[model samples]
Target chain A: MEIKETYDFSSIVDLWNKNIGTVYPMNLELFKQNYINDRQRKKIMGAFNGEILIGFVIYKQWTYKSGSLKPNHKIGYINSIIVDINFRHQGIGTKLLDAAEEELINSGVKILRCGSDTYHFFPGIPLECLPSEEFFLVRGYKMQDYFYDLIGDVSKVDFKKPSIKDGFKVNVMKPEDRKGLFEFLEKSFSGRWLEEFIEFFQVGMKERDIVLIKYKTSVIGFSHIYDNKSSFIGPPIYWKALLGHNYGGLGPIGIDKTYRKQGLGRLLLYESLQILKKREVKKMVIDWTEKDIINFYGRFNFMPWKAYRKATKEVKD
Target chain B: MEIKETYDFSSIVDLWNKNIGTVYPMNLELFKQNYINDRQRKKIMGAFNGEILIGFVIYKQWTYKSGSLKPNHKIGYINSIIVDINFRHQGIGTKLLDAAEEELINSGVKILRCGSDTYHFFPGIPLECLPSEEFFLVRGYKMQDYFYDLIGDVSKVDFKKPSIKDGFKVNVMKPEDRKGLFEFLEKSFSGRWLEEFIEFFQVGMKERDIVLIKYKTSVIGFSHIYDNKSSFIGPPIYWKALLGHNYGGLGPIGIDKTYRKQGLGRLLLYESLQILKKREVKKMVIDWTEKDIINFYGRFNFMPWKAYRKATKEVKD
Candidate 1:
């Protein structure tokens, strides 16, 4: 009946791997890769019921400025906090929170913040449901914001071919065309999305991952897809080995404005899918999209499986 | 005119400071402190028009699998890309992008993605603007998806006194009540929005940044705001800063369904404004909100400064 504080990495790892593993379907390596960084593992705190670990909280320390308003300040973030399902309603969660706060305060952190999941991915807060909300309310946290995770699928899409009477050509990305491909991406998407593409390439993107439509050697439109290793319908592979998978995710596709409404979009999409299907990819996910456009991808037989909303709340200090 | 392919640290620093300074406002030292690490700065790319640096592209190489069908393969991210104003219309931006893509490809990247302000914070891709959309289309980039930014002003806000009859009490957060606060945030808002709060706290949050309302000693509603150091406002300080100088933003505010339609929401908001006004602040921004709730904040004389719509396209490569 007594709650004891524990800081055993192995035990924490065991519990995390045992309980969260089934729900998230992740392995120890992935968990370690994300949560067991030098800062997180060291800063984690746990609450034990007698000799058994019932709850734990992990945090990361960060420093930032509020440009023009505030100078550099130290802060603490609760990256993950979990309590055993069997140990619910016993104030274990609150105690773990208390431990995180105390640790943060001790480290001179002026503020503390933690998050939960609306979609039940993690053992954190469940905002979509009400009971979890009440649990935090009883402890004193305030409702900050809401977020959505919009998704779409691309399977059998009906593309609206471009009306430009001129016949356009489509093909896969090539080594000789890398320069032009980069130019197209830079000119088309210069900010965040473009950066994402660069990161993808840095991690080892094969040329086959890119599908391009051209007008006499000029890259007009393109689509990129990544293979899913966990595909139930196919074998596992890394992003670099995305050539032949049963499922793929669509990302960073574009066409010249001058070429809009010409079935180029649909054509480019169908071409990408053809490539994946050639590699044996059957089901695919078009992640982080708006609901309205679901119909567009729906032309390809992609259906919704999970959904989330992206939300934010400002901090005034 | 010839385009310069290579760029030095000084040039890149100046470009970021001049362009992103207003929003992020970082000096070379601060910039180097956070982003200049070998992992990030090594990949920085720039496009020059005859030695005069006209544009630059920067990206943070990171992996994201949350939305991916393959949870293991690392996903690269394109963080930031910007082009100078006078250098628009020319192919300078494209050149910069080409450089980044080459670097990423050589470094082993797979997927590329980025997020634009959608509201024209910069000159690149104004996804909300037709002309900007055309610009991207010309380069073969498609409208991948869209996000929203909601603004709320607190001028002429009517702070309703907490009603005793409603069995609710609005008050400042207490130290001992941190657990309850965390629980409420977890239960009401889990996921990205909650992560933002945790991020804010991790960086540093002051006592004044948060406000909460309790129904019979149980937290029911909450709001967070930041200072106007950069003269930017998001919440809590909506109309309390200057007539136009200081503005705050609101996020992730919700009341349990059991307490819905009660005056607690208004009371919490009113109290938040009062607190900010006491600190001699005015103006606020409620970023990323639905249109339906505009009238609710409009009651406080907060007019819409800018509006945005979400858009997305799906590809299956």
Candidate 2:
């Protein structure tokens, strides 16, 4: 067997597209669109027996900032390392890893770090579901932190109690009251959280997307939920579409301290869910959250579908 | 002046839609589509001067994993704080902030954090150019070490001379070769990076959005760019719109180390850029990088748009 390195783009693309369902389902068009401007920075290597490609690896270098407060360092992030399953036990994975390491070292990278998911999009990473987390351990990689993807379905949701207060008034937004609304947001949540709202508002939010709870003319609580059908990442848009309901994600809920313990949160939550239910939304994801709230949402029948593990290995040159 | 809290959805929508140009070009319809579910959590506190809404604050509380690692705890992140320019010095911002804080604390949030464009998205931030950073700093809020958006523009892009030796050729990816292409990625860059690609590919990417490079008959390099106009909160797509020519961001790029320093990196980069240019892209952005390679991309004219000081503070109940 003549071990030749390097495979043509055509062969690589064919292998990927054919196995797309079993793998991550990356397509040629997506690859071209993302790398069209940096084609030279990528490398695909394969071991071949004569004209037939048998084994290969694809790797790339990326830079990221250190999460330290001072952030005075540069780190190297490795991406898209793959070895064909047919040739896995033949030292091919090690060869590719060594090759990547050497390249990073030569490039003057001070640190090297690669990430894996507890639930990976592809089936190549065995540790993705392994409780042992030993896959990377044997490769000189250590166990990192865990990352999670928390999803909450709003379809079957029913707010146990909708009326948090007898005298409270809940209504939709109004045009003449915009000045007051903007002021409230600016004064109350003036940091990054506010900015995200501003971003969404600026990009393309409609007036009807907002729901408000009022005490007479006073604003007590409000919630904003959006349609994620157009989203490129995170959950399926069809999940929301097929369910025939306006799936909602929660954001920017607030109330005055003087009104604390009045059950306003529960009131607002039920009201929002009612609106979506009226619109026929079957599922909603609260997106990312910790385990503590699992019990809180568990009261509403929301269960975890995919648990995420986030691990970061320090960059090594 | 009477300070009353109102959760009137339409009023808030009007306020947000009025200043669309200053933020992003948006309308009530788009806002409704995006934020419909979040309305229940919206809380607007306005200080009205006889029917004229001078100042107000809006907030929402939801759980999220703030760090890349699995969160040991769950917390509420604030979204959007806006105060009219004319009402700045009147303690309006403070009032709004107080309302949100009180509500979060009452909701049993162990901690609170806000999102900021530490990486230069949308004029940076508010309060200041990057108010999310500044607002939190002034309020005694600490920056969390997790989560940042990286951006890289192509104004400074430069290509190295082609380094292919005898019998070597470089080309773009073709439709028929996707399977082999993915196989190469699986073999070459398995582990963590592959997982990321898989997650994002399934959740975020569309067909015909990636770019791949080949050396002779071997696929040796890859890059993925996307069009931001097609979607908010992501890198620009280079295929359909060609937004990466003068302003493309670099995501994952890899080259076989055995072929390193042979100008393959430069070749892949040039090829990617050529594709972007074909799409009429004049500006490019590569977000989130360690400071070391700033100069490396600076050779291509990419400069820092925003810098963040990342720090993590404890959440004490």
Among these predicted structures, which one has the highest lDDT?
1
Q: Each candidate: RMSD to true structure?
A: 24.0, 23.8
Give the alpha carbon lDDT tens digit for every residue of B176-229 in model 1: 777887777677765444554554454446545677788777877787755565
- Per-residue lDDT of candidate 2, residues B79-188 (tens digit): 45555443545777777777777776777666655532111122223211232354567776775432212233333233454565675544555667667666767667
Candidate 2 lDDT by residue in tens digits, A174-293: 765556655655655554334444544544455566677777776666666545432322222212322234555544456555665677766776676666566666555543444444
Chain B TM-score (model 2 vs. true structure) = 0.57
Candidate 2's displacement at residue B117, Å, is 9.5
**Error in Å for residue A248 of model 2:** 44
